[PDB]
Amino acid sequence: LHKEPATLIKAIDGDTVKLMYKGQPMTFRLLLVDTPEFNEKYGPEASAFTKKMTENAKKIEVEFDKGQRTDKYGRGLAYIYADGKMVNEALVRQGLAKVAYVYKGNNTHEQLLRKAEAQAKKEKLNIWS
Ligand SMILES: Cc1cn([C@H]2C[C@H](OP(=O)(O)O)[C@@H](COP(=O)(O)O)O2)c(=O)[nH]c1=O
Ligand SMILES: [Ca+2]
């Protein structure tokens, strides 16, 4: 897997962000996670968490997995990095996301994220409290 440049256009919610990728605006959905919706418990905290992460990054990187790169809504599917920290992993680690939507061929960081979830669960963080 390769890291590719992109710039923040706009924070959206816990697991979607609007980025400019190869010069085009695109909504990206974070692979392998599910944040609660804004209208649900920990929804605002997940949105805030991702927002802060992407807005404070001097460098945003997009990492496609081996499989599908856009979903049926035309959202990009990627691992998103903020100054080298993976947002996907960070949300899970803090119990603001569950590991989810694990489809074969788009699951490289699956284990990493389950490990993060296991530790978030252990600590009864946020969604696990
Ligand atoms: C994360 C992810 C979501 N999706 C689709 C599946 C879900 O379909 P449905 O909308 O039909 O439920 C939806 C979940 O995204 P949201 O959690 O952003 O709603 O987006 C994928 O197709 N591939 C993926 O890797
Ligand atoms: Ca969601």
Curated annotation (Swiss-Prot):
The active site is at 29, 37, 75. Residues 109-129 are annotated as: Disordered. Ca(2+) binds at residues 15, 34-35. It comes from Staphylococcus aureus. It is found in: Secreted. The chain holds residues 89 to 223 of 231 of the full protein. Residues 109-125 have a biased composition (Basic and acidic residues). This is Nuclease A.
